[PDB]
Each structure stands twice: as structure tokens, then as C-alpha cells.
């Protein structure tokens with residue numbers, strides 16, 4: 001059947017993921033861009049400006065953890081909306097994997113992946129204290145089942161160079177919170193190891209008490225963020241409820257094909273560099289033969305209406 | 309593999325599910341209300357929070373915005389146990405075994421992910437304390453409907469419900485008769501929605517009427533004619549229209565059965581055992597599935613049931 005190769009470009013904001021993918025796309029391929037219009041208009045109203053202000057009000061000590069928590073938690077629900085719906089309608093047409101030989105019938109490039117809204121950003125906001133780990137796990141329990149051929153390209157960029165970049169300018173409503181850059185960096189690192197650890201066979205349940213290449217110490221995976229007095233019983237173990245969610249986080253990430261593109265270069269180098277990774281990425285067949293078109297018109301509709 | 313029979317006793321609160329469900333149990337396990345999770349574990353006394361906020365809104369002390377915001381977060385917390393459960397359970401579910409009995413194990417659940425991912429949220433929306441966009445965020449998050457999904461919804465006339473809803477109701481509640489009118493309307497609609505979807509109805513093909521099956525104005529789609537969802541030219545944006553596509557594939561495959569709650573206990577408890585006859589069973593995926601599945605229902609029970 002016609003194969004389809006999907007690739008999600010994720011990682012912290014401000015590294016140059018949007019450009020590169022354009023350059024990549026500018027060259028069969030459709031682009032599912034960031035739904036700003038949803039965040040700005042359709043879904044709420046300046047969702048991203050809302051996020052940055054609340055956390056700010058929180059840092060000023062004008063809003064209490066709970067007011068920012070309740071405001072943050074709900075601001076996240078809006079962010080992941082477009083990712084979640086796209087997956088939901090996409091899922092059916094996705095069939096069994098085929099194999100990284102050139103080429104596919106279609107290539108869908110994504111700007112971020114469900115996990116970025118249902119995990120990374122929240123966990124990050126949690127370390128930032130504007131969110132709880134209970135809520136964080138709530139999203140984790142909603143992360144959709146991982147689809148075959150789910151290729152995730154996270155991104156590497158030096159700090160000074162990343163800070164430097166954010167410094168110049170980025171999203172409308174965005175405030176330069178270096179600490180946030182730090183958290184969000186941390187979370188995307190962990191995420192990488194987490195996949196690795198998991199793929200190498202880690203089993204957090206065994207390594208709990210301990211709280212490509214070699215297997216990372218569970219203490220270096222995302223789990224570690226979940227060793228908190230909120231999530232622990234009077235006898236120290238995690239409440240089964242959360243443990244069980246860490247068990248889904250594990251299942252979700254366990255089948256992902258994660259890659260690290262380097263962003264410490266020219267937009268073109270990033271394009272060329274990201275292109276040389278797309279070749280070792282696993283693709284899949286479609287479910288209906290006429291899925292390529294609908295999957296196509298689907299991405300073009302998302303773009304035309306949510307892009308900005 | 310052995311078969312399993314899962315039943316999700318749903319419907320509006322204040323009718324007697326809880327009351328009638330325990331009775332059957334006292335082969336059959338019972339996964340209760342995660343009350344300890346709503347009160348303690350996930351956050352603090354969530355319910356009193358849901359009700360207060362609605363109150364403050366009603367009593368003009370707070371704004372629809374402020375309500376919506378807190379109202380949204382809370383739901384996240386109310387549905388948590390359902391999701392994780394559904395997600396930890398999922399793989400043990402094999403395909404529909406004919407109807408093939410007697411099942412090696414019967415699981416009775418106290419509500420389905422939809423109560424927290426669709427129903428109540430639809431209800432609070434209808435209350436001014438929650439955005440339709442928000443409601444569709446959870447509708448999309450609705451997990452794929454597993455095979456052998458049987459939902460029991462309850463019938464009890466408004467008056468009797470008012471009476472039972474007032475018998476006593478949860479730590480923190482406040483009798484909100486409107487929230488009773490909102491909630492009854494929702495499940496009622498959902499009842500029609502499942503039949504709509506099974507008699508072959510297409511919401512895209514019917515969507516313009518709002519301006520053998522039930523009329524689309526008598527389904528959960530009619531709620532999403534929320535102007536906020538509509539384009540300047542009245543149209544419905546593709547995001548929501550997709551959310552609705554989801555909502556449809558989700559419900560259509562459900563098996564919903566009606567339990568008349570207007571009849572004293574055991575009388576309802578009886579009817580609950582009678583319905584069990586047409587509910588679909590499933591095989592489990594692995595040898596040790598049933599046992600793992602038993603523990604889940606017992607460990608959720610001791611930890612979250614209060």
C-alpha cells in the first residue's frame with residue numbers, strides 16, 4: 001500500500017524549529033503548522049500571553065500558587081486542543097510500519113506532538129510551581145495511544161545561544177523567563193533519556209528506590225520529577241493512582257522513534273541536517289488506499305485555518 | 309481466553325446507581341467512586357470547589373471567566389481516575405465474544421470516562437461556568453472506545469430525582485436544581501445520540517436542520533451550535549467539527565441500556581442483573597489478564613473509594 005512517513009519536530013521553543021521545517025518542506029510533503037490562531041483567537045484569547053502573565057503574577061507574589069495553578073492548568077487544556085484532534089482523526093488511516101526504503105507517498109511534518117501539550121510543557125510548569133504533579137499526571141493519563149511510525153525530532157541548542165535567541169524575540173505575549181527556558185530545557189532532555197532508558201529496557205518500578213548509547217539512571221529520566229510529597233503515601237510509596245499513570249507515560253513513550261537534530265547552525269544546515277535524519281525514520285502504510293488524500297486535505301485544512 | 313463483562317453504571321447523580329450497585333455485590337467486582345481522590349489525593353475537596361464556584365458565579369460574586377477557569381481545572385481532576393483506569397485496562401480487552409458466557413469475571417464500574425470527559429463538562433457549559441471550546445478539548449481526549457463497552461443510564465422522573473438527589477449528596481454539594489436540569493438534559497440527549505449514530509445518522513449531513521432515528525436537535529451535537537464555535541459566516545470551524553467527528557466514532561460503538569430507577573432498591577438492583585443478559589462480553593488478551601484485572605478493581609477500590 002502507499003506508505004506514509006510522519007515526522008514531528010518538537011523540543012523547547014525558540015530554537016528555530018519552524019523555519020527549518022519550512023525550508024525542509026519548501027523542497028509529497030505537507031506541513032501541519034503551530035495553531036497560533038487557536039491559541040490567540042479560536043480557542044480562547046491570547047492563551048500564550050495569558051500563560052506568561054500568570055506565571056509572572058505568580059513570581060511577583062501577587063497571585064498564589066493555587067490561582068496560577070488553576071489558571072495554568074486550564075490554559076494548557078487550550079494549547080493541546082489542535083494536537084489532540086488531529087491525532088484522533090489521523091489515527092484510523094495509520095496502518096502498519098514499513099521501513100525508513102526511499103520514498104513514501106506522503107510526508108506530514110508536524111509542529112509539536114500531543115506529548116508536548118499533555119506532558120512536557122505542564123511538567124515544566126510544574127517545576128515552575130505554577131502547576132501540580134497531580135494535574136500533570138492527569139494529562140499524562142490522557143496522552144493518546146502511540147501510533148506506529150511516530151518519529152519525534154527533539155532539538156539541541158547551546159544555552160547561551162538559546163537564551164540569546166529567545167532574547168531577540170519569539171511568541172506574542174511571551175516573556176523571557178530564563179528559569180522557564182531552563183525547566184523546559186530540562187524536561188526535553190529527560191524526555192530523550194526517558195525514551196532511551198525505556199527502550200534499553202528500564203523499569204522504573206524496580207529503579208524507583210534508586211530515586212542511543214548506555215542506559216540512563218532512572219534518576220535522569222522524566223520519572224524523577226514525580227517523587228513528590230503530594231504524590232506519596234504515609235508509607236512512602238507512590239499512590240497506585242499516580243504509579244499507574246507513570247505506567248502509561250512509559251507505554252506512550254516506549255514506542256516513539258526519537259531523534260536529536262542539532263540547531264546550533266544555519267537555517268540551511270538545519271534543513272540539510274534534518275533531511276539526513278528523515279531517511280532513517282520509520283514510515284507506515286495507510287489504512288484506506290484513499291487515505292493519503294484525506295490525510296493531505298486534513299493537513300492543508302488545519303494549516304489554512306489554524307496557521308499564524 | 310476467558311471472557312470479561314464490563315458494566316459502567318452511569319447516568320445523572322442523585323438517582324441511586326451507587327445504592328443499587330453495591331447491593332448486587334453484597335465473578336463480580338465493583339470499582340467505586342474515587343472519592344478519596346476528589347477530596348484528598350488529587351486535590352482538596354474538589355466537589356465543594358465545583359459547587360462553590362458555580363455558586364459564586366450564580367451569586368454574582370465572581371465572573372463567567374473566573375468560573376470557567378476553575379471549573380475547567382476541576383473536571384481534569386474529576387475524570388483522572390477514570391482515564392488512568394481505562395488506560396491501564398485497555399490492553400487486557402480482547403474482542404467481543406459473540407455476546408460468550410458465563411464470563412470469567414464481571415467488572416462493575418461506577419461511571420465512564422465520558423461522565424468526566426463529555427457529560428458533566430457539557431452540563432457545566434450549559435451552566436455558564438465552562439466554555440464550549442473547553443468541552444471539545446475533553447471530547448477529543450475521549451479515549452478510543454474498547455470492545456465490550458456497556459453503559460447503563462438511569463430513568464427516574466424529575467420530582468423523584470429531586471427527592472433522591474436530596475437524600476443526601478456528597479461532601480461539599482449544594483442542591484442546584486438547575487444543575488439537575490442541565491445534567492438530566494445531557495444524558496438524555498446522549499441517549500438519543502447513541503441511537504442517532506446507530507440508525508445511520510450523519511451530523512455533517514444533518515447539521516443544517518438546527519437552523520428510524522431521532523432529530524439532530526435531540527442529540528449532543530445541537531449543543532455545539534455555540535456561536536463561539538461558529539465562523540463569522542455561521543459556519544463551524546474544522547477543529548470543532550473534528551472534535552465532533554471524534555465524539556461520533558466514540559459513542560456509536562457503545563452499548564447503552566436503560567435502568568428505571570423509579571422503584572425501590574433491589575427492585576433496581578434486580579433490573580441491573582436482568583439487563584446483564586444483552587451486554588457484550590469480551591475475551592481477555594492474556595492468560596493472566598482477569599487476575600491483573602481483579603487487582604486493579606480492588607486496589608482502586610481500597611485507595612480511592614471512600
Ligand SMILES: Nc1nc2c(ncn2CCC(CO)CO)c(=O)[nH]1
Pocket residue numbers: 013014034048051076079080116117121122125171174
Ligand atoms: N502548552 C504550553 N506551551 C507553552 C507553555 N509556555 C510556552 N509554550 C509554548 C508557546 C510558545 C513558546 O513559549 C511556542 O508556541 C505552557 O505553559 N504550555
Ligand SMILES: Nc1nc2c(ncn2CCC(CO)CO)c(=O)[nH]1
Pocket residue numbers: 320321322341358383386387423424428429432478
Ligand atoms: N465530573 C464532574 N462531576 C460533577 C460535576 N458537578 C457535579 N458532579 C457530580 C459527581 C457526582 C457523582 O455522583 C457526585 O459524586 C462537575 O462539574 N464535573
